[PDB]
Structures are given as C-alpha cells and as structure tokens.
Design a protein around this ligand. Structure first.
Ligand SMILES: *[C@@H]1O[C@H](CO)[C@@H](O)[C@H](O)[C@H]1NC(C)=O
Ligand SMILES: *[C@@H]1O[C@H](CO)[C@@H](O)[C@H](O)[C@H]1NC(C)=O
Lengths: 349, 350
C-alpha cells in the first residue's frame, strides 16, 4: 500500500509559494529501521531562474499539486524483488518544494528585493520532518536505524544536513539509533565549462547561498571562511563529515553535463569533453570510503526499479549498500575499472 | 539435479583402504564460479584409533559405500531460498575418506607392520580433484572464482592447503582466477581439558602428523621447526596465511568440548568450564580479519539448510560471507563476534 500524505504541526514551515510543506509515510508494523528519501530536481537562485521555474516546473515550488498518495520504487519499494534489503523498513518520502538544495533557512522573503517573494525553507523542512517522525516511532525502541537518502539536489541535501540530523537524534534527543546517509547523483564539480555559460557556476552558487540563507555544516565552513558556499560541493564537504555516507555517482552524470554546458553531444569535441569529465569525477572521489560509481550516462538511481541491475565487478548496488550498512553498524570502493562511456555492460537506458 | 559422482584419472589416489578417491559435481551451464566443499568427520592417528574407526565409521575410510549421487544443503544447495548467493555457481563435493584432516601424503603403507595397511592421501586427493576440474572448466574463462570451503576436519583442510592451491592455479597454471577459503568449525585450541584424557591432544596431533606424513604450509613450519605439527592449529597457521580466509566458529563448539573432555554438561562445574572455553575461543580469534562467531553450542554450519537463519547483529551468515567476498575481490573485513558472552545468548541459535 502506498506512502500516505502527512502534514507538519508547525504551519510556518512552507514551500516556495507559502503552501504548507509535508511528507509521505508508509509505516511498517514492527521494523525499527527507517529510510527517509529526499527528492531532488535542481534549484533556483535569483528572480529570473525562480520565475522560469514557477512557469516550467511549478510542482517543485508548491504543495498545492501534491496527491494524497505516492508510489516510489527502488529503495522505497515494499516489494522484496525490487528492494531486497529494505522492503520491510519504515519508508518516508519528502517532496522537494523549496528549490534550495535542502539548505534554506529564510523564513520570510529577502529584504533586498521586495519583488523576490519566495520562501526558502529546505533545511527547516527536513529538520521538522525528522522531529515529527519521533512521536510516530523514529528511535522509540533502542537499536533502530535511520538511513537518510537523497537524489540529485536531495543528495546534496543529505550531505549538508547529515551531521546536524545525527546530532539532533543522538545528542539532543538521546535516542539509541544509528544514522547514515546516502547521496545519489549529488556529487558536483566546479570546473571549466565546455563553452562559457550565462553565469559562472560558482557565481550562481554564491547567489543562491545568499538568497536561501543557506545553512552549511560548521566544520566545513571553518575551512572556507572567505567562501563558505564552497561547502555545497560534496568533495569539499566530505573531509569533515563525521557520519557514514555512501556515495553513488554516475561517472558521466547528465546533470554535470548540463552544469558544464556541453549540450546534447553530437560532435567529437563534445564527446571528448564528456570523457574527460568522467575522469575528473572519478578523481574527485579519491578520498571517499564507500563509493559506487559506474561508467554510464545517467542521473539518479535510488528511486528506480532497475537499481537492482546496475553492477560493478558483478556486485549490485543494493548488495554494496547492504555491505556498507554492515560495516558501519558501529567500506567498498566500487569504481568502474574501465574509463569510457557505457563500458559497463549493465548500463541502463 | 544432484551432485553426480566422478572418478579421478590418477588411479593411485586412494582412500584409506586403497579404494579409489573421487568427487561429486554439479556443473552450472553458465557460471565461472566454483564452490568446492571438503567434508569432515574427525581423523585417526594410530593403529588402535584407525582400527576402531574402520569398525565404527567405515564409510569414512573407503569409497566402496559411496552412492552415485549426493544432495548437500547450505552453500551447495541449488535453491535460491536456501543459498541466496551461490545457488547458481558450479558445485563440487569432495567426500572425506583419508582420516588425516586433508593433510596426508602417505602413498604407501608403513611397511614396518602388515596389519597397518592404511594410505593417507588427503592432501593429494584435494590437489588431484582441483587439477581435474581444470579440463571441466575451472578457471577456463578469465575472471572466475574458486571458494574452497570446509567443515570440521575439512575447515582444517582448507587452512592447510589454501595457499598451495592458490599458488597452483594462479602461478603454476596462469589462470586468471580469484581464490578464497572458508573454514567452518575448524578452529581448535590446545588447552587444559576439564579432566585429563587417556591421550593428550598434542600427543595425538604429533602422532597423526607422522603417521599421515602430513604436508604442512612452509611459512608456518619455519616458526616451529622443532614441532611443525603446531601448524595443525588454525590460530598458529593464520598469521602467515596469504589467501583470504573467512572463519566461522561456534563459540561453544561441540568438537572442542569433546577434545576438552567435558562430558555431557549436567553440573555447574562443567557449564562454567564451557563458558570459559567460549571466552578462550573468542580470544584466539583476536587477529582474524573476517570472522562470524555466534554464542551457540553447535558444530558445522555450511552444509546446513538453516545456515541462512544464524545472525549476529541481525547480519546472517550468507550476508557476511557475501560482503567478505566483495571486499576481497582483489585477493586481499567484518568481525562479527557475538556481543554477549554466554551459551545460547543469541536468539537465532539452531
Ligand atoms: C515554527 O517554524 C518557524 C520557522 O522555522 C519557527 O520560527 C518557529 O519557532 C517554529 N515554531 C515552533 C512552535 O516551534
Ligand atoms: C599419480 O599420483 C601418484 C600418487 O600421488 C603419484 O606418485 C604419481 O606420480 C601420479 N601419476 C601421474 C600424475 O601420472
């Protein structure tokens, strides 16, 4: 049966347009394990991008179109064939309606522009959802677990908020619970674009950070006192992250191709750029302890039925995630050993 | 379909009585992975014990009672529910008919006594089976794998022979194959018994070594040149073992209780001895990289249907073995020892 819509008790926590935020829940009768998944879908960082987003992707800026139930595959599927190790866990979906990579703390619209009217509350939404799971069972029985997982902007969202959420549950609330995070397709790089963009990658990030009042991890901003927004990049944040984080990243990630302004690749120049992009991604993952990085073009995987089919060295993604789970109960570096696009026989399409 | 009996091409490789050795096979049409399971069943170490074994356990000294097929559960089951990760591998069973912990090389009876007719060829049987799997497909396609696994005396057999077999396949034959070992209930301790035994452990061990002409790994025997038979103990051999080895051991192992001469426990004194034996086993596993050691009374696990049900920290044995397999895929770990210390404190004990 489906994930059912739920409300937040604090009605001041809202989506971009002021509609109330919320989540979807499928409670399991006896599990003490919880999978909380953050949806993604880019972001907006100024008046023009946010107007375009409202016109083209309205459902990401409001809860007014949310249905009463949702069905999500992959790691939130209740079917053992599709979700071999977490089918019988408590499942939570948090829709993305804040356009701020789950970092925003801006309760009222920016004073700078009285014409920029959007609320950016992503960080406060996540914190409120985790708070509302507690009276519904999260951490109630000692020995329980929380895996906080996210795709795309949700993957960033996990990285940004993981240590805070862990500290809230374990230190503030005194729960006897193991917390871990998974970032799927949220590991982005700032690098020279294929051709010059309308605005520098880093310039959009800085503007967003200001507009959203982005809440960034304290340990990471200490390393970047003059440019704290560098902490939106996973490879910059990772060295000071204390809580276990599994990283899934397609080596030829389609969102990174859009960031790098490659275009739909139809020339050898574009393809060579993509080949090199893959190598840069691979290098950027050098210090990650638990990584699953196939040589395929894609974006997102954790909500997809075919997540069970992607394999590296004949090890499936759910199998790798399960082995990471075992090893962090108090990891595997699976990066493709061939370097070129679609050299993995199990690539989806 | 069952595991089907196969013969060896070399007819000098025999069971204790001189009957021909062999193995059972279930070839999978596609897989490049092989599970090779060594059966156990104690050993005999002198004339008297071998005579008793012939009379009480004859099937362990001969192939004359072997059936044409065998069905073995656990890691050799072809059913996914029973064997979630290896149901679709090639499977091989090597029956135990040499009574020498898979270590013997005595090809000809000790001529000094004509009523001692026994051949002890366990190390030679294993080597030959492996050699004979090559034309059948072992390591034929690059990228394949061998998991050499063993219970009881077979667990010891794996530990004794693993580096040799890996060297044979990878170096001698140049196969592009990843080799790993598993010892189930093969990790024994020489400790003071609950009450003194008629024969003392290290005495039996030394006698068996001589009688079997036991073949021991060189890197271990260097450390014990005066007493190479010390290398029959897992904790002594482990430090110099190069190949990945997963150790399953029940912390209240029944064979250890038999060697320690506790008797069927019906008194607090016996139970307190058993409790401390578990503590000693636990402690002997201190340096082992990949271990699954539940607080349960038992002996053997890999051939059992219920192997899927034993859990430590909610991690099943097959799931731990699979994670070790992933983590050792380059030929280089989860230490799951029970967190409570007392007999049957695990809710999943069989
Ligand atoms: C509700 O949320 C708003 C915005 O985060 C916060 O300012 C306020 O303190 C919260 N109210 C309560 C009662 O927690
Ligand atoms: C067969 O094995 C026997 C006993 O180990 C050995 O002596 C002999 O050389 C072997 N014969 C072969 C390989 O032809």
């Amino acid at each position: 049966r489906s994930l059912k819509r739920a409300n937040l008790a604090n009605t001041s926590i809202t989506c971009n347009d002021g509609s109330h935020a919320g989540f979807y829940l499928r409670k399991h009768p006896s599990s003490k394990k919880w999978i909380v998944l953050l949806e993604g879908g880019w972001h907006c960082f100024d008046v023009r991008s946010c107007r375009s987003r409202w016109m083209r992707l309205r459902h990401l800026m409001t809860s007014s179109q949310w249905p009463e139930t949702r069905d999500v595959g992959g790691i939130l599927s209740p079917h053992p064939e599709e979700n071999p190790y977490w089918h019988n866990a408590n499942h939570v979906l948090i829709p993305y309606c804040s356009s701020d990579s789950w970092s925003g703390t801006r309760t009222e619209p920016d004073t700078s522009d009285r014409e920029n009217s959007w609320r950016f509350m992503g960080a406060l939404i996540l914190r409120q959802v985790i708070a509302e799971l507690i009276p519904v069972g999260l951490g109630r029985v000692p020995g329980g677990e929380l895996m906080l997982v996210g795709s795309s902007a949700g993957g960033m969202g996990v990285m940004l908020n993981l240590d805070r959420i862990r500290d809230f549950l374990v230190n503030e609330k005194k729960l006897q619970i193991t917390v871990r995070g998974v970032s799927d397709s949220g590991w982005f790089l700032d690098r020279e674009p294929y051709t010059p963009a309308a605005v520098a990658s880093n310039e959009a990030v800085r503007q967003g950070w200001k507009l959203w009042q982005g809440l960034l991890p304290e340990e990471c901003t200490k390393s970047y006192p003059t440019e704290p927004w560098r902490c939106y990049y996973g490879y910059r944040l990772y060295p000071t992250l204390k809580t276990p984080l599994f990283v899934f990243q397609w080596l030829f990630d389609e969102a990174q191709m859009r960031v790098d302004n490659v275009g739909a690749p139809v020339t050898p120049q574009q393809w060579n750029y993509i080949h090199e992009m893959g190598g840069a991604l691979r290098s950027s993952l050098d210090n990650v302890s638990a990584v699953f990085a196939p040589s395929c073009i894609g974006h997102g995987v954790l909500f997809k039925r075919d997540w069970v089919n992607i394999k590296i060295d004949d090890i499936s993604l759910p199998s790798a995630l399960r082995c990471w789970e075992h090893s962090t109960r108090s990891g595997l570096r699976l990066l493709e050993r061939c370097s070129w696009p679609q050299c993995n026989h199990s690539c989806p399409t």
